Design a protein around this ligand. Structure first.
Ligand SMILES: CCCCCCCCCCCCCCCCCC(=O)OC[C@H](COP(=O)([O-])OCC(O)COP(=O)([O-])OC[C@@H](COC(=O)CCCCCCCCCCCCCCCCC)OC(=O)CCCCCCCCCCCCCCCCC)OC(=O)CCCCCCCCCCCCCCCCC
Ligand SMILES: CCCCCCCCCCCCCCCCCC(=O)OC[C@H](COP(=O)([O-])OCC(O)COP(=O)([O-])OC[C@@H](COC(=O)CCCCCCCCCCCCCCCCC)OC(=O)CCCCCCCCCCCCCCCCC)OC(=O)CCCCCCCCCCCCCCCCC
Ligand SMILES: CCCCCCCCCCCCCCCCCC(=O)OC[C@H](COP(=O)([O-])OCC(O)COP(=O)([O-])OC[C@@H](COC(=O)CCCCCCCCCCCCCCCCC)OC(=O)CCCCCCCCCCCCCCCCC)OC(=O)CCCCCCCCCCCCCCCCC
Ligand SMILES: CCCCCCCCCCCCCCCCCC(=O)OC[C@H](COP(=O)([O-])OCC(O)COP(=O)([O-])OC[C@@H](COC(=O)CCCCCCCCCCCCCCCCC)OC(=O)CCCCCCCCCCCCCCCCC)OC(=O)CCCCCCCCCCCCCCCCC
Ligand SMILES: CCCCCCCCCCCCCCCCCC(=O)OC[C@H](COP(=O)([O-])OCC[N+](C)(C)C)OC(=O)CCCCCCCCCCCCCCCCC
Ligand SMILES: COC1=C(OC)C(=O)C(C/C=C(\C)CC/C=C(\C)CC/C=C(\C)CC/C=C(\C)CC/C=C(\C)CC/C=C(\C)CC/C=C(\C)CCC=C(C)C)=C(C)C1=O
Ligand SMILES: CCCCCCCCCCCCCCCCCC(=O)OC[C@H](COP(=O)(O)OCCN)OC(=O)CCCCCCCCCCCCCCCCC
Ligand SMILES: CCCCCCCCCCCCCCCCCC(=O)OC[C@H](COP(=O)(O)OCCN)OC(=O)CCCCCCCCCCCCCCCCC
Lengths: 51, 206, 346
């Protein structure tokens, strides 16, 4: 959980994971969010009513 | 009379054992022939031995008799049926005659169309998909990967992917193991997939 | 150009699809030499055991027909020892081992090789179950029909060899062994002596091979959820599937083999024509259209089951072990899985 300088190539890593990522027969939704990605997630508090 | 139509004289007629004893041409329409009745002497003796102390019935010793095939359904006579159903337009009164023989009986006919009936799902699905080429002409074709850098680099990106895999970042990612190993090699102007890639080689450009 | 029909060769243009997997791709191991070798090995191994079991059971029956059957464990042990040391048992074992070598190499090996040739390329779905087995059905049917009649010559040679031994010295050919009988029959009686009226054997072989190979291939993938999600024992599941496959094969094959008894062995009514005119095909049709199944299912176990099912079960197990039923599975969103990587994560 530290923002360190990347010695690799970020674009190369992104392309490689896009093209030939490793999957499995039993992969959780958390690690498989192909069709469940958006931007600006809606943040709410917990343990309180909202209209 | 013609011996060519007689099975006894004409040996070229293949007798159907499953229709022995049944002659559709001899039916009455309505059928009014009795072919079943009490049968004895097969397992139950016809004589009386209820009080015969010196005679004991052994049903296990059943003698074999002639096989009794199940009754064959009637077969249509084309000319006779067509004449019977035929009615003269403006020369016949519209009425039903008293005689019951005028009843329109159903008689089984040619069986060839029932082959197509049985094969209909295959034929119908073939027409739907293969004949109409639905949803497209490539879904049912044997899959072939695109040739090297074909049709355009923006779509294929074989060379850039190869360079990335051969680069430091690609090797590091492979070591991490999240990215699987490269599946093709760029030969002298051609792309060849590895035998473990589980895909066919790209079709030739001609 | 060369004869009346011309095999016109035509060229085509490039075509490709989004997905390069789950279709038909010939496996590198699917070759004439490798497939034939694996099939012959598995068939011979299965046939040796099958024929040894058949010989042992038949010798046990022969001994029991003259001596009382075992009453307890000690009596059973001595009975088995006596059967093993019987002179007839050793000769039967030798002859049936030769018969197994002939069968497993020319019939079961051919069946396995053809099945691998026609069904190696049917890829399965990654992280899923293979659908569209209707596509595989024609391949299995073609293989079964092609390899069905490869056992009738050997079976007829075996029957002739065993039936010659029971004739007087004057009328006995005097075959040294099963191999000698097989080599001599074609030149003495002719090639057609080993194929005449072969419909029962051919249909039996077809209904065995097709419903064994296809049913095992279907089950081993469709019931895989048991050990893929339920964490069951994969080997036990495969054994159960093989048992089901062989039982179904025996059930579907015995009725057609029953035609021999009905046509030749059933007593003939004096003065009346033969119920089937001596036609095994017509007898099989009658069996197919018969209302009562038990009538022609009688004698299923005492006559055919223990002579056919164990061999088929062993053949299925050996084929699975060697890899005649192994398919190639790759991810469809992987590098080689599809040609559109822009939507595999987006
Ligand atoms: C060695 C390897 C194997 C080789 C195989 C070679 C053959 C192909 C495979 C066939 C299947 C084999 C497997 C067995 C299946 C079981 C049945 C079976 O075959 O039993 C034996 C079968 C017995 O036939 P049956 O129907 O039981 O009784 C016949 C008796 O004569 C009945 O006597 P009847 O007096 O009571 O009645 C007279 C007449 C009564 O006639 C009528 O009622 C007239 C009907 C109205 C007029 C139009 C008729 C012609 C159009 C066809 C029907 C269209 C409507 C139905 C829609 C579906 C059509 C498929 O009978 C009919 O009904 C005859 C017409 C039957 C039409 C049904 C379809 C036949 C074709 C079957 C598939 C094979 C061909 C595929 C390609 C073509 C498909 C069309 O005998 C045969 O071998 C016949 C085979 C089929 C007919 C020949 C088709 C050849 C097509 C070639 C191209 C066109 C040339 C001719 C046109 C003119 C020149 C251009
Ligand atoms: C690969 C194709 C895949 C297609 C898949 C399709 C899947 C969907 C559909 C599935 C169902 C299809 C059903 C088709 C119609 C069946 C009709 C039927 O039941 O009645 C026919 C027939 C009834 O005849 P029948 O008048 O009632 O006589 C009854 C007798 O008990 C028995 O008859 P028999 O005793 O009078 O005669 C028995 C037959 C025995 O023949 C055989 O065992 C040969 C195999 C085919 C026999 C089929 C019967 C004969 C058909 C006409 C002639 C066929 C020529 C050969 C095959 C190519 C042409 C089709 O004898 C002959 O015809 C002549 C034998 C001559 C002596 C042997 C010489 C062999 C050649 C040696 C030199 C060449 C090879 C080595 C050297 C190579 C170069 C180095 O029954 C049979 O023969 C068996 C039918 C079994 C049906 C169940 C399914 C299995 C079918 C297997 C047939 C094909 C075997 C492999 C050869 C072809 C592919 C390579
Ligand atoms: C789930 C039900 C829910 C509602 C419950 C309602 C109340 C209770 C049920 C009503 C009473 C039914 C009584 C049946 C037994 C009768 C006596 C007996 O032992 O049978 C021998 C008896 C023949 O003896 P016979 O008359 O002395 O034979 C002299 C002649 O050979 C004359 O022979 P033939 O010409 O009649 O030909 C006979 C031949 C031709 O007939 C057949 O081949 C029959 C084909 C039936 C196919 C459908 C059944 C399921 C097939 C497997 C599917 C996989 C999953 C199975 C389990 C989950 C689904 C249920 O079959 C055989 O060779 C023998 C058949 C096997 C006998 C099984 C012995 C156990 C029976 C007791 C019940 C067993 C329940 C477990 C599941 C079934 C196990 C077989 O067979 C019959 O009378 C026919 C019925 C045989 C049993 C099947 C019917 C019951 C199950 C219905 C299931 C409904 C769902 C179907 C779709 C499933 C999709 C996965
Ligand atoms: C998903 C849930 C599913 C639930 C439903 C399924 C579960 C069962 C439900 C309840 C019904 C079954 C329980 C009651 C009956 C049990 C059987 C019985 O009492 O009869 C005994 C009887 C033996 O003959 P027998 O009656 O004692 O006569 C002796 C005579 O002295 C001489 O005999 P013979 O030569 O004169 O022949 C007599 C033969 C006359 O011949 C016949 O009738 C044979 C044809 C019978 C009908 C076939 C179609 C119906 C059954 C299949 C479809 C429904 C089940 C679907 C199952 C799906 C998978 C779970 O008599 C019979 O066998 C007829 C009665 C018994 C069979 C039919 C009625 C029971 C249903 C079938 C039970 C067995 C299923 C096996 C697996 C099936 C997989 C699909 O049958 C058996 O023993 C066969 C089953 C056991 C086979 C074991 C070996 C199989 C694998 C091959 C191994 C090769 C060696 C290598 C070993 C390696 C080891 C590591
Ligand atoms: C089970 C097959 C036999 C069925 C017999 C009873 C039904 C009558 C026959 C129906 C057609 C049978 C399939 C072969 C012919 C298909 C022709 C066609 O239009 O397909 C083009 C179509 C596509 O053609 P297309 O797309 O180029 O164009 C069609 C025409 N337009 C332009 C209008 C669209 O191709 C297919 O669907 C592929 C069919 C493959 C079939 C392979 C198995 C059969 C081959 C061996 C047959 C041997 C026996 C002879 C045939 C039977 C006896 C006569
Ligand atoms: C088993 O599949 C089949 C074949 O092999 C693949 C065939 O060859 C054939 C072709 C064979 C023929 C036309 C000849 C049939 C036999 C004849 C005519 C002789 C007389 C026979 C009889 C009277 C017996 C009748 C018996 C039956 C109707 C029962 C047959 C049983 C069948 C089809 C299977 C029963 C169910 C199972 C094995 C369950 C298996 C499932 C699992 C283990 C779980 C799978 C799980 C998932 C999620 C898919 C068929 C029809 C078939 O169904
Ligand atoms: C209930 C019935 C329907 C059952 C479901 C069927 C679903 C598919 C549609 C098939 C319809 C006809 C029945 C054919 C069954 C056997 C062949 C088969 O299923 O074909 C599938 C397979 C190709 O599919 P595949 O490439 O694996 O798909 C995924 C690719 N990524 O192809 C092969 O394996 C090759 C097979 C070659 C021979 C096929 C011959 C089909 C003939 C059909 C009738 C045609 C009638 C034409 C009439 C013309 C009239 C003018
Ligand atoms: C697959 C669903 C679609 C097909 C049709 C379903 C019909 C359902 C009718 C109800 C009765 C059948 C029982 C339910 C279906 C089979 C079991 C199943 O769906 O698999 C799930 C289950 C394990 O699931 P779960 O515990 O959630 O796994 C989490 C892992 N972290 O798996 C297990 O625990 C394995 C249990 C397997 C039982 C199979 C019984 C039916 C097959 C025919 C009989 C097989 C007999 C031989 C079994 C040998 C087992 C060694």
């Amino acid at each position: 959980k530290l923002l360190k300088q990347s010695i690799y190539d970020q674009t190369t890593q992104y392309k490689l994971i896009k093209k030939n990522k490793k999957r499995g027969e039993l992969i959780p939704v958390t690690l498989a969010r192909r069709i469940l990605r958006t931007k600006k997630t809606l943040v709410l508090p917990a343990h309180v009513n909202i209209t | 009379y013609d011996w060519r139509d007689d099975p006894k004289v004409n040996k070229d007629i293949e007798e159907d054992i499953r229709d022995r004893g049944w002659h559709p041409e001899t039916y009455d329409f309505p059928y009014t022939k009795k072919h079943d009745d009490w049968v004895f002497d097969v397992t139950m003796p016809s004589q009386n031995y209820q009080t015969d102390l010196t005679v004991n019935i052994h049903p296990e010793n059943k003698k074999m008799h002639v096989m009794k095939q199940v009754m064959r359904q009637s077969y249509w006579d084309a000319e006779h049926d067509m004449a019977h159903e035929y009615d003269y337009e403006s020369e016949d009164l519209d009425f039903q005659c008293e005689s019951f023989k005028s009843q329109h009986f159903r008689k089984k006919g040619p069986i060839s169309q029932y082959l197509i009936l049985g094969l209909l799902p295959i034929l119908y699905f073939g027409t739907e998909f293969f004949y109409n080429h639905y949803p497209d002409e490539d879904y049912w074709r044997v899959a072939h990967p695109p040739p090297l850098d074909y049709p355009d680099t923006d779509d294929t990106d074989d060379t850039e992917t190869f360079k990335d895999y051969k680069s430091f970042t690609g090797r590091r990612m492979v070591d991490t193991g999240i990215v699987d190993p490269l599946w093709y090699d760029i030969r002298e102007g051609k792309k060849v997939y590895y035998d473990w890639a589980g895909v066919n080689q790209p079709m030739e450009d001609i | 150009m060369f004869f009346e029909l011309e095999d016109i060769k035509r060229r085509h243009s490039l075509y490709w699809d989004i997905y390069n997997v789950q279709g038909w791709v010939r496996r590198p191991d699917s070759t004439l030499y490798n497939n034939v070798k694996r099939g012959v090995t598995a068939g011979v191994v299965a046939s040796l055991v099958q024929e040894n079991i058949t010989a042992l059971v038949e010798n046990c029956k022969l001994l029991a027909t003259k001596y009382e059957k075992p009453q307890n464990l000690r009596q059973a042990a001595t009975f088995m020892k006596e059967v093993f040391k019987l002179e007839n048992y050793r000769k039967a074992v030798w002859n049936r081992s030769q018969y197994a070598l002939c069968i497993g190499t020319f019939d079961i090996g051919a069946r396995l090789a053809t099945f691998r040739w026609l069904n190696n390329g049917w890829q399965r779905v990654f992280a899923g179950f293979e659908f569209n087995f209707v596509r595989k059905i024609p391949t299995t049917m073609l293989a079964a029909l092609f390899t069905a009649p490869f056992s009738v010559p050997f079976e007829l040679a075996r029957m002739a060899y065993y039936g010659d031994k029971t004739f007087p010295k004057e009328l006995q050919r005097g075959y040294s062994s099963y191999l000698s009988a097989l080599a001599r029959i074609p030149f003495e009686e002719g090639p057609y002596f080993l194929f005449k009226n072969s419909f029962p054997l051919i249909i039996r072989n077809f209904f065995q091979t097709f419903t064994l190979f296809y049913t095992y291939d279907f089950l081993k993938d469709k019931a895989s959820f048991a050990w893929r999600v339920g964490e069951q024992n994969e080997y036990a599941c495969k054994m159960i599937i093989a048992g089901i496959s062989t039982y179904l094969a025996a059930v579907f094959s015995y009725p057609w083999m029953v035609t021999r008894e009905m046509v030749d062995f059933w007593p003939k009514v004096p003065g009346a024509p033969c119920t089937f005119n001596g036609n095994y095909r017509k007898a099989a049709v009658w069996i197919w259209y018969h209302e009562f199944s038990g009538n022609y299912f009688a004698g299923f176990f005492t006559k055919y089951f223990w002579k056919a099912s164990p061999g088929m079960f062993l053949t299925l197990m050996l084929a699975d072990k060697v890899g005649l039923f192994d398919q190639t599975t790759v991810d469809n969103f992987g590098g080689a899985g599809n040609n559109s990587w822009e939507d595999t994560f987006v």
